[PDB]
DNA sequence: TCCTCCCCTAC
DNA sequence: TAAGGTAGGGGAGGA
């Protein structure tokens, strides 16, 4: 009430912004006809490309706003407009008693009186309901409203009634007790409109008086006006900038391929000149300069320029977190209004959004969709990886000084950030997101930023809606859970399977010893015919009938196999192969028809197992019960500072908070008495997957899988292509290489979303929660990969295994690739080691119970066999190096290096080199070391070459760093560690990051550690002696402080007052670093060297005793 | 020697 | 207030 006044004032303000920027609210010509989408052209109205959409309140051309959505269009004529749909918000009440429905209808029609606009009886399929497969629907009351405000009040009015639900004791029930639950009450409005109306951003539409008519003719988006900007500010030495005090010394940016720079000459010592920055032909960048007087000349110039070009997309890089908020503040102090200026402002999440223009923050794409590791999510590494060139770097601390000192080069660097950001946006973020919008009921701002789980839920809501299925409410996690009287600390299911089986060096040129099992060779022979058939019909989708050389090929293989049976002990060059199941979990789901609503609790079939794993306290109910009364006797603080009541009973805390104390009180009691905090126990469990249920969920997974397989296909064609034709150099292909990066990126950017269909069943607030399904997917996978390993174990050596992949060696004698010939001359490709696995998967893991609706009207189901699980193969490779543990008998999982034959790095997994932070010495040393495994011409020769490098590095550290320039040394010895939260939120915890952060607070001021995500860069020191490692962490920033400053703290931290030497060398605990460098040499070189019968190739690093002992 | 925390990778 | 999952390496503390 009365707050519609607000939004209509605001909605109105937006309407003026939209008009300023070129979106006049357009209304289609009146027409009362019966148009056929066939004849769209005949119909009066405007054709536009939908580029955006937002919820707004609208004035009646009582007196309260009407809710609707503004849809932002670009038209075929290079213009823009916005059209508005209105649509009453709604949600449902569901009831226990089907019979008394009109009863409740009358109650609420009056009880809600004040806010209700309409009311109605509708029917939706509820999968929670018995025999809905026979056609039975749940009956609901559709509650509609004039605006979302009114809808919220209705919820407020039913809150009471709902909780209450959940006289003459010697005893026609009241209409209140029948209201069991409301439904679809938390669907965001604009989503509600996009789904029901079936409108998507990114699609073409003719706006007519009937509604939006999709023009399926138009292929290709329209070309919005894209601007990308990056700002540079003044920093203090060693500190973060402050919008409070510091100035925007420049603002570089691009607009449809044309650079601009805006300098603030109150900082820039000279009028900068127009210049060309063009990292590559594909990326031309000529800039124009707007040297401006002070801060505000630049600001206003910026805004004027936005207004001028009217951009629908403004892109940045972490602009939400830094760039925008800066600008905003510098705008206020200069007394400008940014909202009035260009119509941008922060939303409820502190993120900066406009109405007419999307703010595409590329960092969001990198974080979520790039599949890059966090250590490579900076604009430089992103640029290197995704753009293929080396961006300009500049030490942050020099950016201010160079403003005066070397201005033009500072300006050169700034345009680089923009060129990167702009072409990263246009080449990756733009197509991906906007295409994503064509299937997801979100606008670009949201399609870029929502969790992938949320992207999945949206898709599933469409699918459920269009099938007339009623949405389950969001799941809420339970307060506490028990197992055998024990309070469960945590519980889950056993995930994927991971094995480290062999360490060492493996090269296509160094023979390896094989111990083949003739038995296994037998089986492959007996299977061969049916397997070869499988490859043709299934893997390639043909018939053996059209096959020319099915028989030649069968013996080529057979000969080699037989040879291996007799000659089963051999010694030859290895084929270094990798096999990996394509979209494993999604295909396990779609194969077994796994979906949350198919898991029935005995009522009311495919039995599949999973493995539950609980982590519980050793204590029991009595001890649990005992602990509570003790806790009932205490006081706690009132969380809600909106009350003057400061002290709270235990029973007054939420059940939620209660359980926290109980846990932390019971954890200690457990410790003293039992005397462990957790017990873990694994229980095999079984579940029933009904095979006839509405497959709307699993169908959605299938649709999105197929969407990714295509990208995965042609990205294999261009990999396919490259290898032959364009590998002849000279060439500007190069282009083939550029296709692959772009497709593998698209297929990869789908990968996390796809696999989130699996994770979604486990997410908080999931509408489709099922732990059973998630467990079943994982146990099936574990079973499949262990079957594969067991086979390879017998015809080669598996080196490492993770969830759905095996790295292995096979003997060169093992049959590999062949081609089937057709009557048509076309050739079908076969990789026997792959297809040999796949035939076996399908023999054992096929779903023979898969059912489907052939006849919906007659409810007739047909049964058939489903299986879409396939290993695919890559390689063979030139080399794979695998680390080994320091602890005996244990290995290292999820770490290795693989090299192509052309000598390039195929894959680096897991190592510190790739990780964010870590000790830089180790990163560099690892960078150095791996390629050296490609040398020597014997095994021990290989370790020889690799040791030499080890020794140069040991030297540097034994040498106490005397060999190293000061600027180089300070780089190598740094360790960078990200604090995930803020220092304060760690209280009672000891870490090198904490200490460093602490000290970085005093040296520079608590303004340094205010925010989250602080990068603590530190060294270890010898002094104070004896002090635990977490105590000797020193902020590298000190050695850049002016001397008097460095003294006090060095003195303060070293805990020795006398000291007056300030060389970083005097400080460093070299014994620390020699040792961390030694552990790496051990795991990566010497200990793997051992396991292959090679004496310690780096004797300056001594074996572990246990490994010495094993020597004898 | 083991567990536990945290960050960040691998699936 | 919005929010996919589990398995693992390894540094560092302490039971
Ligand atoms: N971000 C990820 C990566 C993987 N997985 C789970 C589900 C995957 O199916 C399984 C296998 O990992 P892959 O990396 O092998 O994933 P796919 O098999 O799904 O991908 P590809 O088609 O590249 O083989 O692990 C996951 O849940 N989330
Ligand atoms: Ca920036
Ligand atoms: Ca896979
Ligand atoms: Ca894999
Ligand atoms: Ca671990
Ligand atoms: Na390692």
Coordinates of C-alpha atoms in Angstrom, one line a residue, chain A residues 530-817:
Chain A
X530 CA 30.2 -59.1 -31.9
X531 CA 32.4 -56.1 -30.7
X532 CA 33.4 -55.3 -34.3
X533 CA 29.8 -55.4 -35.2
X534 CA 29.0 -53.1 -32.3
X535 CA 31.5 -50.5 -33.6
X536 CA 29.8 -50.4 -37.0
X537 CA 26.1 -50.4 -36.0
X538 CA 26.3 -48.4 -32.8
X539 CA 29.5 -46.3 -32.7
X540 CA 29.2 -45.4 -36.4
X541 CA 25.5 -45.9 -37.1
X542 CA 25.8 -48.2 -40.2
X543 CA 25.3 -51.9 -40.9
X544 CA 27.9 -54.5 -41.5
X545 CA 26.0 -55.1 -44.7
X546 CA 27.5 -52.0 -46.4
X547 CA 31.0 -53.0 -45.2
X548 CA 33.8 -53.9 -47.6
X549 CA 36.6 -55.2 -45.4
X550 CA 34.9 -56.4 -42.2
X551 CA 36.7 -59.7 -42.6
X552 CA 40.2 -58.4 -43.4
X553 CA 40.1 -56.2 -40.4
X554 CA 38.9 -58.9 -38.2
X555 CA 42.0 -61.0 -38.8
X556 CA 44.5 -58.2 -38.8
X557 CA 43.3 -57.7 -35.2
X558 CA 43.1 -61.5 -34.5
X559 CA 46.7 -62.0 -35.7
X560 CA 48.0 -59.4 -33.3
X561 CA 45.9 -60.6 -30.5
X562 CA 47.0 -64.2 -30.9
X563 CA 50.6 -63.1 -31.1
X564 CA 50.2 -61.5 -27.7
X565 CA 48.7 -64.7 -26.2
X566 CA 51.7 -66.8 -26.8
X567 CA 54.3 -64.0 -26.6
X568 CA 52.5 -62.8 -23.5
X569 CA 55.7 -61.7 -21.7
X570 CA 57.1 -58.9 -23.8
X571 CA 59.3 -55.8 -23.7
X572 CA 58.6 -53.0 -26.1
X573 CA 57.7 -49.4 -26.8
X574 CA 54.4 -48.3 -25.2
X575 CA 51.4 -46.8 -26.7
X576 CA 50.5 -44.0 -24.2
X577 CA 46.7 -43.9 -24.3
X578 CA 43.9 -42.1 -22.6
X579 CA 40.3 -43.2 -22.5
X580 CA 37.5 -41.0 -21.2
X581 CA 33.8 -41.4 -21.0
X582 CA 32.0 -38.6 -22.8
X583 CA 29.6 -36.7 -20.5
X584 CA 29.7 -39.5 -18.0
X585 CA 27.2 -38.6 -15.3
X586 CA 24.6 -37.1 -17.7
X587 CA 24.6 -40.3 -19.8
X588 CA 24.4 -42.5 -16.8
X589 CA 21.3 -40.5 -15.8
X590 CA 19.7 -40.5 -19.1
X591 CA 20.6 -44.1 -19.6
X592 CA 19.0 -45.3 -16.4
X593 CA 16.3 -42.7 -16.6
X594 CA 17.5 -41.2 -13.4
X595 CA 15.6 -38.2 -12.2
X596 CA 14.6 -37.0 -8.7
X597 CA 10.9 -37.7 -9.2
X598 CA 11.5 -41.2 -10.3
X599 CA 12.9 -42.4 -7.0
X600 CA 9.9 -44.0 -5.1
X601 CA 9.9 -44.9 -1.4
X602 CA 8.5 -48.4 -1.8
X603 CA 5.3 -46.8 -3.3
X604 CA 4.8 -46.5 -6.0
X605 CA 10.9 -50.4 -11.4
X606 CA 14.6 -50.6 -11.5
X607 CA 16.7 -51.3 -8.5
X608 CA 20.0 -49.5 -8.4
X609 CA 22.5 -49.1 -5.6
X610 CA 24.4 -46.3 -4.1
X611 CA 26.8 -45.8 -1.2
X612 CA 25.8 -43.6 1.7
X613 CA 28.6 -42.2 3.9
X614 CA 27.8 -40.7 7.3
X615 CA 30.1 -38.9 9.7
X616 CA 28.7 -39.1 13.2
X617 CA 29.7 -38.5 16.8
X618 CA 30.7 -41.4 19.0
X619 CA 28.2 -40.2 21.6
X620 CA 24.7 -41.5 22.1
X621 CA 21.3 -40.1 22.8
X622 CA 21.8 -40.0 26.5
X623 CA 25.1 -38.2 26.1
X624 CA 23.4 -36.1 23.4
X625 CA 20.4 -35.6 25.7
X626 CA 22.6 -35.0 28.7
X627 CA 24.5 -32.3 26.8
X628 CA 21.2 -30.3 26.1
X629 CA 20.1 -29.8 29.7
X630 CA 23.6 -28.5 30.5
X631 CA 23.2 -26.1 27.6
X632 CA 19.7 -25.2 28.7
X633 CA 21.3 -23.6 31.8
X634 CA 23.1 -20.8 29.9
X635 CA 22.7 -17.4 28.4
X636 CA 23.5 -16.2 24.8
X637 CA 23.4 -12.9 22.9
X638 CA 20.4 -11.7 21.0
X639 CA 21.4 -12.0 17.4
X640 CA 18.7 -9.5 16.3
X641 CA 20.0 -6.0 17.2
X642 CA 16.6 -4.6 16.3
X643 CA 15.6 -5.4 19.9
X644 CA 16.7 -3.9 23.2
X645 CA 16.6 -7.4 24.7
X646 CA 20.3 -8.4 25.0
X647 CA 20.2 -11.7 26.8
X648 CA 18.6 -14.9 25.5
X649 CA 17.6 -18.3 26.8
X650 CA 18.8 -21.4 25.0
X651 CA 15.3 -22.4 24.1
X652 CA 14.9 -18.9 22.6
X653 CA 17.5 -19.4 20.0
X654 CA 16.4 -20.8 16.7
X655 CA 16.4 -24.6 16.5
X656 CA 19.1 -23.9 13.9
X657 CA 21.4 -22.0 16.2
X658 CA 20.7 -24.4 19.1
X659 CA 22.1 -27.3 17.0
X660 CA 25.3 -25.4 16.5
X661 CA 26.1 -25.1 20.2
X662 CA 25.0 -28.7 20.7
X663 CA 27.4 -29.8 18.0
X664 CA 30.3 -27.8 19.3
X665 CA 29.6 -28.7 22.9
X666 CA 29.2 -32.4 22.0
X667 CA 32.3 -32.4 19.8
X668 CA 34.5 -31.6 22.8
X669 CA 32.8 -34.1 25.1
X670 CA 33.3 -36.7 22.3
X671 CA 37.0 -35.7 22.2
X672 CA 37.6 -36.3 25.8
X673 CA 35.6 -39.4 26.2
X674 CA 35.7 -41.4 23.0
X675 CA 38.1 -40.0 22.1
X676 CA 37.5 -38.8 18.5
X677 CA 35.1 -36.2 17.1
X678 CA 33.8 -38.0 14.1
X679 CA 33.1 -41.6 13.1
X680 CA 32.6 -42.3 9.4
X681 CA 30.6 -45.4 8.2
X682 CA 29.8 -46.5 4.7
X683 CA 26.4 -48.2 4.0
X684 CA 25.4 -49.8 0.7
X685 CA 21.9 -48.8 -0.1
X686 CA 19.3 -49.5 -2.7
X687 CA 16.7 -47.5 -4.5
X688 CA 13.9 -47.9 -6.9
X689 CA 13.8 -45.9 -10.1
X690 CA 10.3 -46.2 -11.7
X691 CA 10.8 -46.3 -15.4
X692 CA 7.5 -44.8 -16.6
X693 CA 7.5 -41.6 -14.7
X694 CA 7.3 -38.2 -16.5
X695 CA 10.8 -37.9 -18.0
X696 CA 10.7 -34.1 -18.1
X697 CA 13.8 -33.8 -16.0
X698 CA 16.0 -36.4 -17.6
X699 CA 14.7 -35.2 -21.0
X700 CA 16.0 -31.8 -20.2
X701 CA 19.4 -33.3 -19.5
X702 CA 19.3 -35.1 -22.7
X703 CA 18.5 -32.0 -24.7
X704 CA 21.3 -30.1 -23.1
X705 CA 23.7 -32.9 -23.6
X706 CA 22.9 -33.0 -27.3
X707 CA 23.4 -29.2 -27.4
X708 CA 27.0 -29.8 -26.2
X709 CA 27.9 -32.8 -28.3
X710 CA 27.5 -30.8 -31.5
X711 CA 30.1 -28.3 -30.4
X712 CA 32.1 -31.2 -29.3
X713 CA 31.7 -32.8 -32.6
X714 CA 32.7 -30.1 -35.0
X715 CA 35.4 -29.0 -32.6
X716 CA 36.6 -32.5 -33.3
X717 CA 36.2 -31.8 -37.0
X718 CA 38.6 -28.8 -36.8
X719 CA 40.9 -30.9 -34.7
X720 CA 40.2 -33.5 -37.4
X721 CA 40.7 -30.9 -40.2
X722 CA 43.9 -29.4 -38.8
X723 CA 45.9 -32.6 -38.7
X724 CA 45.5 -33.0 -42.4
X725 CA 45.6 -30.2 -45.1
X726 CA 46.3 -27.1 -43.0
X727 CA 49.3 -28.8 -41.3
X728 CA 51.2 -28.0 -44.5
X729 CA 53.1 -24.8 -43.8
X730 CA 53.4 -22.2 -44.9
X731 CA 49.9 -21.3 -43.9
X732 CA 47.6 -18.8 -42.2
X733 CA 45.9 -21.7 -40.5
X734 CA 46.3 -20.8 -37.7
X735 CA 42.6 -20.5 -38.6
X736 CA 42.0 -24.1 -37.9
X737 CA 43.8 -23.6 -34.6
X738 CA 41.5 -20.6 -34.0
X739 CA 38.3 -22.6 -34.7
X740 CA 39.3 -25.2 -32.2
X741 CA 40.0 -22.8 -29.4
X742 CA 36.7 -21.2 -30.0
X743 CA 34.7 -24.4 -30.1
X744 CA 36.4 -26.3 -27.4
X745 CA 35.6 -23.2 -25.4
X746 CA 31.9 -23.4 -26.3
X747 CA 31.7 -27.1 -25.7
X748 CA 33.6 -26.5 -22.4
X749 CA 31.3 -23.7 -21.4
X750 CA 28.4 -26.0 -21.6
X751 CA 30.2 -28.7 -19.6
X752 CA 29.8 -27.1 -16.1
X753 CA 26.2 -26.3 -16.7
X754 CA 25.5 -29.8 -18.0
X755 CA 27.1 -31.6 -15.1
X756 CA 25.2 -29.2 -12.8
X757 CA 22.0 -31.1 -13.8
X758 CA 23.6 -33.8 -11.7
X759 CA 24.7 -31.6 -8.9
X760 CA 21.4 -29.8 -8.7
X761 CA 19.7 -32.7 -7.0
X762 CA 22.0 -31.9 -4.1
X763 CA 22.1 -28.2 -4.0
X764 CA 20.5 -26.1 -1.2
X765 CA 17.0 -24.9 -2.0
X766 CA 16.8 -27.3 -4.9
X767 CA 13.3 -27.9 -6.1
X768 CA 14.2 -31.4 -7.1
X769 CA 16.2 -32.8 -4.3
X770 CA 17.4 -36.4 -4.3
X771 CA 20.5 -37.8 -2.6
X772 CA 19.7 -41.3 -3.9
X773 CA 19.9 -40.2 -7.5
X774 CA 23.2 -38.5 -7.0
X775 CA 24.6 -41.6 -5.2
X776 CA 23.3 -43.9 -7.8
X777 CA 24.9 -41.9 -10.6
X778 CA 28.2 -42.0 -8.8
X779 CA 28.2 -45.7 -7.9
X780 CA 27.4 -46.7 -11.4
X781 CA 30.3 -44.7 -12.7
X782 CA 32.6 -46.2 -10.1
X783 CA 31.5 -49.6 -11.3
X784 CA 32.0 -48.7 -14.9
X785 CA 35.5 -47.3 -14.6
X786 CA 36.6 -50.2 -12.3
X787 CA 35.4 -52.6 -15.0
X788 CA 37.5 -50.9 -17.6
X789 CA 40.5 -50.8 -15.4
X790 CA 40.2 -54.5 -14.7
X791 CA 40.4 -55.2 -18.4
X792 CA 43.3 -52.9 -19.2
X793 CA 45.1 -54.3 -16.1
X794 CA 45.4 -57.5 -18.1
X795 CA 46.5 -56.3 -21.4
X796 CA 48.7 -53.4 -20.4
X797 CA 49.4 -51.2 -17.5
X798 CA 47.0 -48.5 -16.2
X799 CA 49.0 -45.6 -14.8
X800 CA 46.2 -43.4 -13.2
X801 CA 42.4 -43.4 -13.1
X802 CA 39.9 -40.6 -12.2
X803 CA 36.1 -41.1 -12.1
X804 CA 35.8 -41.9 -15.8
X805 CA 39.2 -41.8 -17.4
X806 CA 42.2 -44.1 -17.5
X807 CA 45.7 -43.2 -18.5
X808 CA 47.5 -46.4 -19.5
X809 CA 50.3 -47.9 -21.5
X810 CA 49.6 -50.7 -24.0
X811 CA 52.3 -52.5 -26.0
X812 CA 52.9 -51.3 -29.5
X813 CA 51.9 -54.8 -30.6
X814 CA 48.3 -54.1 -29.5
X815 CA 46.0 -53.4 -32.4
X816 CA 44.9 -49.8 -32.6
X817 CA 43.3 -47.9 -35.4

